[PDB]
Amino acid sequence: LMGPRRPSVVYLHNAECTGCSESVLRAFEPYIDTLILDTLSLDYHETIMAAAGDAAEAALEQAVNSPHGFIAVVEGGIPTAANGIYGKVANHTMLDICSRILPKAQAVIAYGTCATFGGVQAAKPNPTGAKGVNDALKHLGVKAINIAGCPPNPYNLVGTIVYYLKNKAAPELDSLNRPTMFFGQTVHEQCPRLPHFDAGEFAPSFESEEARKGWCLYELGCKGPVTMNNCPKIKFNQTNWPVDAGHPCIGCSEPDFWDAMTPFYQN
Amino acid sequence: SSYSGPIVVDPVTRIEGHLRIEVEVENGKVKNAYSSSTLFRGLEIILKGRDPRDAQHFTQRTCGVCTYTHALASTRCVDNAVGVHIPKNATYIRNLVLGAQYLHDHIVHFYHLHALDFVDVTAALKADPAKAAKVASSISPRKTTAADLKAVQDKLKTFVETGQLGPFTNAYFLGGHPAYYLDPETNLIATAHYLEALRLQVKAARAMAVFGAKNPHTQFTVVGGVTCYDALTPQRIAEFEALWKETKAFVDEVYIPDLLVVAAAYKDWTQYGGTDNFITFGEFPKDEYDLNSRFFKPGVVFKRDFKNIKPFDKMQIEEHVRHSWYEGAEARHPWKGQTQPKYTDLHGDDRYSWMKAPRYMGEPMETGPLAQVLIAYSQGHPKVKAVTDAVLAKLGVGPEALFSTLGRTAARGIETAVIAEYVGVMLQEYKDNIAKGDNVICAPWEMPKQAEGVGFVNAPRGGLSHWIRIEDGKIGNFQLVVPSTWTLGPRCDKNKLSPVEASLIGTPVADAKRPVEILRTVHSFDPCIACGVH
Ligand code: SF4
Ligand code: SF4
Ligand code: F3S
Ligand SMILES: [Mg+2]
Numbered sequence: 001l002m003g004p005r006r007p008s009v010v011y012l013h014n015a016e017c018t019g020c021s022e023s024v025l026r027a028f029e030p031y032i033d034t035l036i037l038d039t040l041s042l043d044y045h046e047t048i049m050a051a052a053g054d055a056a057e058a059a060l061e062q063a064v065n066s067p068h069g070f071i072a073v074v075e076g077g078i079p080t081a082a083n084g085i086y087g088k089v090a091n092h093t094m095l096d097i098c099s100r101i102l103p104k105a106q107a108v109i110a111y112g113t114c115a116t117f118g119g120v121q122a123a124k125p126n127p128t129g130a131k132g133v134n135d136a137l138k139h140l141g142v143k144a145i146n147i148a149g150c151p152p153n154p155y156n157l158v159g160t161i162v163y164y165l166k167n168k169a170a171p172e173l174d175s176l177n178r179p180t181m182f183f184g185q186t187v188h189e190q191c192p193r194l195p196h197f198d199a200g201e202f203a204p205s206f207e208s209e210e211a212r213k214g215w216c217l218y219e220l221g222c223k224g225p226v227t228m229n230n231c232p233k234i235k236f237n238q239t240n241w242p243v244d245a246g247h248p249c250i251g252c253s254e255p256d257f258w259d260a261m262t263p264f265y266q267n
Numbered sequence: 268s269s270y271s272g273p274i275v276v277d278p279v280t281r282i283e284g285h286l287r288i289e290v291e292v293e294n295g296k297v298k299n300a301y302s303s304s305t306l307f308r309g310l311e312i313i314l315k316g317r318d319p320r321d322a323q324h325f326t327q328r329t330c331g332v333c334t335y336t337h338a339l340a341s342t343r344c345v346d347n348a349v350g351v352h353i354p355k356n357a358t359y360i361r362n363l364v365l366g367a368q369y370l371h372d373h374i375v376h377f378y379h380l381h382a383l384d385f386v387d388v389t390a391a392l393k394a395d396p397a398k399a400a401k402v403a404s405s406i407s408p409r410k411t412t413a414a415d416l417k418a419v420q421d422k423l424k425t426f427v428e429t430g431q432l433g434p435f436t437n438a439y440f441l442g443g444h445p446a447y448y449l450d451p452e453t454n455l456i457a458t459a460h461y462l463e464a465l466r467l468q469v470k471a472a473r474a475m476a477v478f479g480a481k482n483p484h485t486q487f488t489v490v491g492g493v494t495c496y497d498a499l500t501p502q503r504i505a506e507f508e509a510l511w512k513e514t515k516a517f518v519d520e521v522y523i524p525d526l527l528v529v530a531a532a533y534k535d536w537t538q539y540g541g542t543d544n545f546i547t548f549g550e551f552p553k554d555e556y557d558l559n560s561r562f563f564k565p566g567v568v569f570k571r572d573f574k575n576i577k578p579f580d581k582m583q584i585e586e587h588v589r590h591s592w593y594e595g596a597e598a599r600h601p602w603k604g605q606t607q608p609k610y611t612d613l614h615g616d617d618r619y620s621w622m623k624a625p626r627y628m629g630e631p632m633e634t635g636p637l638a639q640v641l642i643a644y645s646q647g648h649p650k651v652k653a654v655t656d657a658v659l660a661k662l663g664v665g666p667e668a669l670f671s672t673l674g675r676t677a678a679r680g681i682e683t684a685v686i687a688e689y690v691g692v693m694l695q696e697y698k699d700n701i702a703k704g705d706n707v708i709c710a711p712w713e714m715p716k717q718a719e720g721v722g723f724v725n726a727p728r729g730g731l732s733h734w735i736r737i738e739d740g741k742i743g744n745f746q747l748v749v750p751s752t753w754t755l756g757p758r759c760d761k762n763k764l765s766p767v768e769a770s771l772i773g774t775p776v777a778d779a780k781r782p783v784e785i786l787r788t789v790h791s792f793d794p795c796i797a798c799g800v801h
Contacts, residue, residue, distance in 0.1 A: 015306060022483045026482065037422060041433050046278050052786060062436070079307075086306070086307045088306070094306075150328065206709040207492070212706075239506070258313075258325065264321050264324055265320050
């Protein structure tokens, strides 16, 4: 898969929707072709890799056991109920897969709220006992860098990897193990509608003239004040973000947000 | 050298989600098949008791490949339950984002998920770029030169020589493979365009974020309409239009010519992976309450009898669990749906998948581009007929060729081309509506305490439906019935093989250690296991 030269990345998919992988495909300057050809060696990734079945399993072993070392990027929560059986790949539970592989990584990045905190399948009543990576694997000493969002900004993944490769270390992390360079500000403090919030100028409904005029979406449920992310600054796809599209923030980079931030249209 | 015995492909890569395919091979051909979906999340369980307005935010996370589609289905479903008739502009904006989703999804599927089943990337290094450029220029109005393709070859050569093959590690074509047919030049053309498509899809996805906030996982839909007042502005409309125009040019000038050159080389693939029955829900409405107002219309076809398209009756859907890891054996209509997991391991009590098995009047139904295209054709859809006929003529094949893995793959391209053009029609209609002074994008509505609703989307993989029972103003039951559930779910309580299972019978396998022929058929359906199981 890899040998010397480019740093090896092993990308794993647990209980996920593949939205985080799709977000990586949206990488901009650098784009994903530069990342895969020049920056990194993407040595396992079930969504785009050529090999399948036994050949994919051999590709993964070859990467994980390389003397050159690898970085793990993990998408999805780990289902732990009923001894892990709710999620299997190659007939191994995801819990087992991740327990065997992640302690061998030089660094682990949990990419997306599912991998970081449990995510959507961990919302009540959590039938599969889905956990974030660090929760699930605490006992093995795994401490993944958490890049939260649903999905995160891919700027934040690339920036973290670049930093790690340059500095041979994790960047400063917050108390949720998220990089402070991306997660140090609330969405709200960065929001263009903040002057309306301060003036108590709130849209009372989506059809209202106040919404048309771009008034604050707090009364319609916006969780910007309690959410740490860089959305207003970086935006998505080089062009927009939820509140500029007129819709409240739903809190998607926070732990337990499915249950803590709901109902999404109330504050 | 003809293999008899099992083959397991686990993981099936180059799909969304976690699929295990099991086949029995006799004398080098598949005699039997099982489609085993190996991740469950249980979103329907999680939704119980919640605010119906919250459903679209949860269900969008069914799947990030077919992002937006579930938000749209849930919003259509709750719109329907509350009886709101959303403004014309909300229909246009919702439809335009969906059109953009189809273009993004199908371009990535052909190049980044399917094509490695047919393209030997390493053989592109052997190619003559001048010859390759001539071929490329002959198939497309876009002119390609020798230097253009040599740049690709030089980049690839550096990559391969580093010994770090990355995503190409252990590819079934490495070393050569008897089922891979392309010459070096055609491999080089396809590889060049694979790489180009990695950047083009960025623009295709950006088109969705212009109105929809972001991709993946849009954030512009609400019960009653949409939120994006900025989508009315000439600047955002122009931004969308420019991304759409560039995306359409890629569809027309790169994807479809590539699809045709590859199909022409693999014409034996008209002989494998046919199916009998088709279902489609229609898409791109004028009237949110009338499926027959959609640009593609709904319909049902049994045993390839396209002369007798049946109306779609939503009450004739039931989802089976007898061969699934749920309690019992009773099929349910989704307004009486049940999601009661009970794992028995592979083939335990004859159960082998986390997907339910949807049946229509008891029958297994393919859904997705081949169903949408064939039914629309048979309904006299002029744009679908013109494009389909042109593809058949180019390939020198008859319409029977469509009932196959190649056919299905071709139909995905046909639909992409037709949708790409129709997005321009919708866009113009949207502009016209704004020009008449209609600036409304959301309608008021009220939550009933008790209601039933259903929302229908024809998504890039086919007929998607979300079903709600509202009780005390809360979600009493919320059921998703998803295109990949139809296509890749298991057997039902009548033991009928699902479309993917049945389509695999007869597949030749040259080399059981590298069973690319199974992947070709499976990938032709564009499986989404997060979708299928939720
Ligand atoms: S974090 Fe969100 S987008 Fe990423 S895998 Fe989980 S549900 Fe999907
Ligand atoms: S719209 Fe949301 S993030 Fe912006 S000012 Fe209002 S509450 Fe804060
Ligand atoms: S919903 Fe998520 S993407 Fe940003 S605006 Fe709020 S943290
Ligand atoms: Mg369901």
